[PDB]
Amino acid sequence: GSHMDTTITQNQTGYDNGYFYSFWTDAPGTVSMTLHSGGSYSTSWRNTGHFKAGKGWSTGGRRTVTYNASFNPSGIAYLTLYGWTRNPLVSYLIVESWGTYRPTGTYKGTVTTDGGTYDIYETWRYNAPSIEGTRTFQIFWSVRQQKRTSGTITIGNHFDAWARAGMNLGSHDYQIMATKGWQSSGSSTVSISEGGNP
Numbered sequence: 001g002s003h004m005d006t007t008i009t010q011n012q013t014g015y016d017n018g019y020f021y022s023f024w025t026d027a028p029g030t031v032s033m034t035l036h037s038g039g040s041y042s043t044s045w046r047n048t049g050h051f052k053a054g055k056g057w058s059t060g061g062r063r064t065v066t067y068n069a070s071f072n073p074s075g076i077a078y079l080t081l082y083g084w085t086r087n088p089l090v091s092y093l094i095v096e097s098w099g100t101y102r103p104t105g106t107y108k109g110t111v112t113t114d115g116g117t118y119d120i121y122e123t124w125r126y127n128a129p130s131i132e133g134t135r136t137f138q139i140f141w142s143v144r145q146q147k148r149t150s151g152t153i154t155i156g157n158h159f160d161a162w163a164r165a166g167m168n169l170g171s172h173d174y175q176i177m178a179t180k181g182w183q184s185s186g187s188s189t190v191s192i193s194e195g196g197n198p
């Protein structure tokens with residue numbers, strides 16, 4: 001594209017081609033995010049700490065989104081539609097692919113959506129970094145039963161299934177198609193846009 005790509009290595013957020021982006025890590029210098037044209041970005045990490053990087057929207061909602069990804073973890077990493085709510089403070093992850101560790105937790109059934117079935121889990125995070133600072137909060141999970149690296153995510157269907165399982169979201173903060181991980185190494189290239197049939 002005409003876009004002059006840049007590479008981010010320090011915690012930050014902003015907009016790029018109308019897309020909200022977020023980069024966060026506790027191991028600066030060991031992970032980078034490259035901003036591409038439109039809703040595209042790449043990541044690269046080597047012996048990192050915690051990291052999360054993605055493009056999407058500064059205010060989340062019941063969007064139907066379509067993505068395409070190259071996802072290459074050597075350890076614990078996820079390819080995931082990732083977001084936050086406030087009141088209550090909740091982090092949620094719709095997990096499309098994973099590395100050496102598949103997420104698990106308190107199992108609350110399944111949701112079938114977008115050509116596949118997802119396991120539903122709730123976990124808790126204690127005194128951890130958040131959009132509200134150091135906090136204890138819920139994590140809502142949908143983990144696809146088979147990995148994939150492209151397709152359409154009907155976010156509304158996950159929200160509804162969680163609600164039926166008694167997993168209640170607050171007022172939406174950001175919502176990104178993220179590459180997230182803990183330590184080890186890897187790379188990703190991810191393209192996201194709103195669109196596709198719900």
Ligand SMILES: [N+]
Nearest residue numbers: 049050182183
């Ligand atoms: N750690």
Ligand SMILES: [N+]
Nearest residue numbers: 050076181182
């Ligand atoms: N993690």
